[PDB]
Amino acid sequence: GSLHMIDYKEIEVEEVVGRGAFGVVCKAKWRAKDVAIKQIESESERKAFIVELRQLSRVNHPNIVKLYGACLNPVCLVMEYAEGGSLYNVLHGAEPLPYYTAAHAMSWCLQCSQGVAYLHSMQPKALIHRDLKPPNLLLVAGGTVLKICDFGTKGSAAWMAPEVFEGSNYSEKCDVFSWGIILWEVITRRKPFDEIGGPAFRIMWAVHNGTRPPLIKNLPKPIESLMTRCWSKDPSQRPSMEEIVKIMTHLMRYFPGADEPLQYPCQHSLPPGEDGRVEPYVDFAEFYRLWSVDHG
């Protein structure tokens, strides 16, 4: 593809607002627009930043961060300012948190799978994200549109597929695992493996021994079936991202209201405990009602 060259002097750097696998992301201004820039911290991570630039120049999809351009001296990527911040911050951040619906949960997950499916279909060689997690999922358009960033490629163990820890030959299917865990997280509004805690190796041992997030009380069987297939030990038993897109696209018939912006506050006491099954944050009553009308 191609990249728009940008003069660094034309960029005005405001406060630092995030930190990826490498570099540091900041809020900024450029040419009568709000923008997010991503500068290098050191010369050691220059080669990583160039490969990211070469990949981002090729990608073009509604659910991947728009890259306006780049600077070469100093090295930095100029991106769209995601108004809504990260998904992580919307789910778990500082109060007041926003109210969201099952429809938002499923729409977010559909949009993520749409973006990952585009990367997995890239020719000649597929782009694997390798680090899919809510801190890398940004929200725009009042919290209704989701976008993937920091792709290609620590603190990620909770979303990372077992075969990746093991140093084993891995594939596209590592992102399907991550997506599975993200679906649980948006439905429950819970940090996965928060109760295990400790350092990263403790979650890695857990997940390697078969541990997965608890099942969700009253979760529709079609959604429970997709979720649990996504986090199989064997990556060949997980569905492709193309299959996830189709299934999730079809399910959205029963989840209307995904285009409503997040505007209501939420007072939070998500009921912990009850070992084994957990309660969802979102409500499925409307799902079951609409399903029944179509089926019986």
CB of 11 to ligand 1UO, least distance (A): 14
The amino acid at residue 251 is L
In what helix (H) or strand (E) does residue 244 lie, and over which residues does it extend? helix 241-251
Among the listed residues 131, 150, 275, 283, the single catalytic one is: 131
Name the residue nearer to ligand 1UO (CB basis): 36 or 110: 36
- Please state the closest distance from residue 4 (CB atom) to ligand 1UO, in A: 16
Which residue's CB atom is positioned nearest to ligand 1UO?
18
Positions of E strands within 95-214: 97-98, 137-140, 145-148
Query: Is the peptide bond prior to 96 cis by the omega test (within 30 degrees of 0)?
Result: yes
Least Å from the CB of residue 263 to ligand 1UO: 15
Give me 70's structure tokens: 């780049």
Residues of the shown chain interacting with ligand 1UO in the complex, contacts defined by CB under 6 A: 17-18, 20, 25, 36, 38, 65, 79-82, 85-86, 135-136, 138, 149-150
The token duo for 171 is 């594939």
Active-site residue flag, 194? no
**Strands annotated E in 141-247:** 145-148
| Residue 65 or 282 with smaller CB distance to ligand 1UO | 65
Of the two residues 80 and 243, which places its CB atom closer to ligand 1UO in the complex? 80
Q: Please, what is the minimum distance in Å from the beta carbon of residue 42 to ligand 1UO?
A: 17
Tokens of 260: 């409503």
Is there a contact between 170 and 163 (Cβ–Cβ < 8 Å)? yes
**Contact, 287 vs 220, CB < 8 A?**
yes
> Between residues 38 and 173, which has the closer beta carbon with respect to ligand 1UO?
38
Which positions are annotated as active-site residues?
131
